[PDB]
Amino acid sequence: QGEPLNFLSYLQDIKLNGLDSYVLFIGNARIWEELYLNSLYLFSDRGIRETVYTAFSETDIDNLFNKSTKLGEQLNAFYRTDIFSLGNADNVVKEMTIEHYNSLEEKFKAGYDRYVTREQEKSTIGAWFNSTFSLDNTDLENLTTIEEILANVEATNAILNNSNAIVALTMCKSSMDAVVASSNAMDLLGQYILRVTTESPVIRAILKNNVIRDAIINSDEAMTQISSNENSVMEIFNDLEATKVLVQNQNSINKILTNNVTVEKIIPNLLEMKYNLQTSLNYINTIKSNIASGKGQIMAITYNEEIFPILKNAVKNYDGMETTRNISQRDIEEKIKISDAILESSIAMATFANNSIIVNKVGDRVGIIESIFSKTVSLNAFMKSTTAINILVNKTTAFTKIANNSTAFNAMLTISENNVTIANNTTAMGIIANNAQAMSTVANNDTSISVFVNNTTAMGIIANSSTAMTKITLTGLALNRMVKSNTAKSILISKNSTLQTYKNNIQNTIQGSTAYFRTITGFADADDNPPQTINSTYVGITYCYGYKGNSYYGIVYHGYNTSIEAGRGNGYKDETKKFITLGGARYDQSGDGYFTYAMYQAI
Amino acid sequence: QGEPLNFLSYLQDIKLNGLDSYVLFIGNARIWEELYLNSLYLFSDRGIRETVYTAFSETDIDNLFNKSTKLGEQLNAFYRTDIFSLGNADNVVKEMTIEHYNSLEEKFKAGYDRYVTREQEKSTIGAWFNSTFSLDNTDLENLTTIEEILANVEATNAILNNSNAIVALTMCKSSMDAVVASSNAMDLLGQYILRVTTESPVIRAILKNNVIRDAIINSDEAMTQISSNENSVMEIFNDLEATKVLVQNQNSINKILTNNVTVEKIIPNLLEMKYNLQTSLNYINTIKSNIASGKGQIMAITYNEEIFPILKNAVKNYDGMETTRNISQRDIEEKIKISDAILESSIAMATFANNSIIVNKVGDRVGIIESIFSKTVSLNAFMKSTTAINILVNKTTAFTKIANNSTAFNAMLTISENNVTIANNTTAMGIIANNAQAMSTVANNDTSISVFVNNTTAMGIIANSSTAMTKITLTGLALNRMVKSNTAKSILISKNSTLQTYKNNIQNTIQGSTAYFRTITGFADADDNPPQTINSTYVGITYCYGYKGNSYYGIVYHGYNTSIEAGRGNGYKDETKKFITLGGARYDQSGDGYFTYAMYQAI
Numbered sequence A, B: 001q002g003e004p005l006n007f008l009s010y011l012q013d014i015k016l017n018g019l020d021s022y023v024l025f026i027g028n029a030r031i032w033e034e035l036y037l038n039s040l041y042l043f044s045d046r047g048i049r050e051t052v053y054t055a056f057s058e059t060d061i062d063n064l065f066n067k068s069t070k071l072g073e074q075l076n077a078f079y080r081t082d083i084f085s086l087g088n089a090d091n092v093v094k095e096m097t098i099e100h101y102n103s104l105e106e107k108f109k110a111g112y113d114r115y116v117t118r119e120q121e122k123s124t125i126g127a128w129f130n131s132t133f134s135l136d137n138t139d140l141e142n143l144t145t146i147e148e149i150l151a152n153v154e155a156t157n158a159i160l161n162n163s164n165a166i167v168a169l170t171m172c173k174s175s176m177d178a179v180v181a182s183s184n185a186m187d188l189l190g191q192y193i194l195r196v197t198t199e200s201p202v203i204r205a206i207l208k209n210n211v212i213r214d215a216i217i218n219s220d221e222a223m224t225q226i227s228s229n230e231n232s233v234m235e236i237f238n239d240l241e242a243t244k245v246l247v248q249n250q251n252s253i254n255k256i257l258t259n260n261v262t263v264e265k266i267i268p269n270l271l272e273m274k275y276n277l278q279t280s281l282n283y284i285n286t287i288k289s290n291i292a293s294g295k296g297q298i299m300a301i302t303y304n305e306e307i308f309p310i311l312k313n314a315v316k317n318y319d320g321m322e323t324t325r326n327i328s329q330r331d332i333e334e335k336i337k338i339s340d341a342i343l344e345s346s347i348a349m350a351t352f353a354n355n356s357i358i359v360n361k362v363g364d365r366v367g368i369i370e371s372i373f374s375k376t377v378s379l380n381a382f383m384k385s386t387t388a389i390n391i392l393v394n395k396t397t398a399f400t401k402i403a404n405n406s407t408a409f410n411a412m413l414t415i416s417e418n419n420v421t422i423a424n425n426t427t428a429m430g431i432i433a434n435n436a437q438a439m440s441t442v443a444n445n446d447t448s449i450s451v452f453v454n455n456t457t458a459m460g461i462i463a464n465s466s467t468a469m470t471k472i473t474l475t476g477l478a479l480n481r482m483v484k485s486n487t488a489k490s491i492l493i494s495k496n497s498t499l500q501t502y503k504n505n506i507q508n509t510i511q512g513s514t515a516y517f518r519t520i521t522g523f524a525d526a527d528d529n530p531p532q533t534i535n536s537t538y539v540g541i542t543y544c545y546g547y548k549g550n551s552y553y554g555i556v557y558h559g560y561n562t563s564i565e566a567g568r569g570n571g572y573k574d575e576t577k578k579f580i581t582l583g584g585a586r587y588d589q590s591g592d593g594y595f596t597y598a599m600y601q602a603i
């Protein structure tokens, strides 16, 4: 037999009774201790593991650390590993690393902390560090508090450059509390990171350690060091939780943005990434169905309700492909989360929205603006930044994507100054004016259409776009605002034929939309010239023809410029001899003409 | 008698905890071994059997075979039987048969294999054989390799005349390889080994030597043995070159067809396989493009002209998928080759074409007939087998597929007896007559149409098919043969309206195809009744109308039965009052009628 029989009976009763076992009653602690100090089976019996971990009191963990002559073997059995050194707690602490420490559960982490505190409080902290890890530093020897150690750079680095001593230093709650409090220690810690940045396991283990991670990312000093090395920052964005901590600290964001490589290459790649990753994930999920089908072809050939033996490998291969594929999927789904952690941070997005290098990258790189559109926070941050729009209005591809995304377009138009920025850009206005959806949004947005029709550039382009005109001439609001604009009246009167193209749309919209137009003069016949009226809010509709259908002409000119003819006509009254006038009207005759005329006003 | 208490506690913990028991943790292997080497209760406790079998590592089974002094008792308890001899592994091996070996589960079969390999590959192979199976041979005692044994005739004969020693020999890959390698290999296989075992290892080792393979596959004796074991035959079709040798020997094909499992299950699967494999290969090649695209998405995110480090794994994963996929592809491409080796063998195909079980499988199983169509040899073998066609004419789906495949249809019609078989089958004739493509092939095939139009069944169906008729009435050859047929003339004159439906087709085909029709009498007008002519190869075309367009009737009757009216007409000459007569014509009038008539003859 390996262990005594009563130990086996104790394990049986623990399995059968959980925490209700007589073994785990406080009154029987004496035997319970004897078990966990001497049994290996207790720590290798997974079927009771959940109970055992719960049963361990703080005193029990202290007893383990202080008394067990095989704490290493018991930890190795308890975590199904071999990473811990054999023997008592001193052998375990001597070979402990941050990675191996992170493999521990909470109770054993706390046990490590308390044990190291006890051992330091026996002798002195400096002498304990020096002798335990053989740091061979006499300066450290005579230091009696953690503050005295942090005042000495030589001793601090002697500790930090030891994989085990750093675990002792960082994972002792009080000691760590001093390190966070010291402005100098943080700096040294930051420098430590820079040295390890190319030892991938070490840096990854550091970033998976919540205490060190959180202290480093939120430290002004440490980040200052780390930001200088783009490859260190790279490792932070390779870890989801570290990224989540980072994108919630304004100061650390600014710090990493002090590095030109980070700004130019790392951040745009992190933004561009989600689009490429989602596309790759679509291909992965297509491969899943293709694997299922190709395997189903093989499965259909049966032999005693089993696979046809000659094809057995063909099945196994298809399963292998399904394994690796699944792996791929997981990995990709992880990286997307990282992107989502960045895109969902208003702190990180707003800042990026006011950085001109990053916004130029958004404009230049296919995929970044798609990723930005994939989240509300990132979308609003960029669409509502007048700086970002001021840059992006010159990026035709990105701005076309904005104009086609109704949500991003509407978000962009919530800022008036963005409307002004757009109006003064010939390219952008050219895109919008020839986009039926966008022009539909603009025509029903008072601010946007009011800015556009009163801007010489935008209104110049709109007048040359049959799409935009159409929409505007069918919308009461837009037609009202356009009629009131002197810029629009001037441009349209210089392009009279374009104006008259939409005479029916204009008549119908004016007469229909009483919310935006009122009648000044109902239709009336006139043998002699009616008195001219000039008012920059007026719209006239005038039938010109001859008296009793003779061959003499009625002529109508715009009110906003009474020298520009809007139209003329002889013969009989007719829908083709009916003309729109802007800003009023002036009436004239060549011979005995005749008019049937009405006047309206934009409210 | 009785087992120690800790063993009972171990069994109890195994029951309570399954694989989570401390007993089954690798770190406690020492006690686990001590259990399974010394306990029978472990092997007779059915309540934990599934766990125990799962817990056994390869090393554990090796330890059992090497060290247990009661392997026989433990095997008997574990399989609730008495077939294994008592004592250690040597006693068990001494009485082992193929029957008892096959009753073992995979782990213990593998254990037997590894144990006998270890014992034979030592320098005590001769002594082990000698003592284990009680061969009373002192020469064998001192032989140290299998080659030294095969050089000695006495020792070989001592071993081979023991069936169990042969089992031990055959389950050891290297030893078997020597037997295949030995100069008198054939003899040894013929006289001793094959009689006792045709199992998979034997056939596998035989197939690695081209000479021994070819001799075995072409041996009437050996095949007779091998054919009785369907799983041995399975191993031959799992090897391309062995299949290529097999499908070139008529006698060996017949031998393997003496096994009903081979005929009913193995051969149809080998035939059905190519279709499923080609479909799976299409899916594989789609996966190739999907992997390329999904990887290209990741490759586009660069950093100093290298992959963005955060995505490095995403690249490797995509390469891994490309590795496994490629493996899959090769394997599938191999199996197709095997199918092609079978389909391209006229010997193997012809034989299968005259096996009613296999032909019924061809008719019943989707995929087999496509595979057969995929190769010229296999297609011609089945389409030209009158037995196969005699079965397939009753398989509606398969025969429709034949009728739609122009190549298979044309191949089938090269055999006259196949035409006879089809003509007398209502189903088949129903499919062909309503298939415009097939009827096109038939109408231009002298033999097929000649058989069809002279058969009361086929000709009965053709007369009711507007498709078939159409084709026939537009083809000189077919119309000639149909006109000459007395069966067809009888059926068609009994269906006079159906005949007259195609009067224009018939007129055009007769006048156009001078190769198949000649004019006896050019069109001529007639006031009085022309003299009747009767000839079973004649076709008449007769316009019937009134004299000078009056309301009196001309009437025309068929020559083959001068009492059956073909048509009548009054008024003026007209294309609707024109009638076909078969076998000659008889003319009559109701009042002063009038005719314009011509007579033709099928050459």
Ligand SMILES: [Mg+2]
Pocket (backbone or CB within 6 Å): A526, A527, A528, A547, A589, A591, A592, A593, A594
């Ligand atoms: Mg007048």
Ligand SMILES: [Mg+2]
Pocket (backbone or CB within 6 Å): A527, A592
């Ligand atoms: Mg006048």
Ligand SMILES: [Mg+2]
Pocket (backbone or CB within 6 Å): B527, B528, B547, B589, B591, B592, B593, B594
């Ligand atoms: Mg007459």
Ligand SMILES: [Mg+2]
Pocket (backbone or CB within 6 Å): B527, B528, B592
């Ligand atoms: Mg007459």
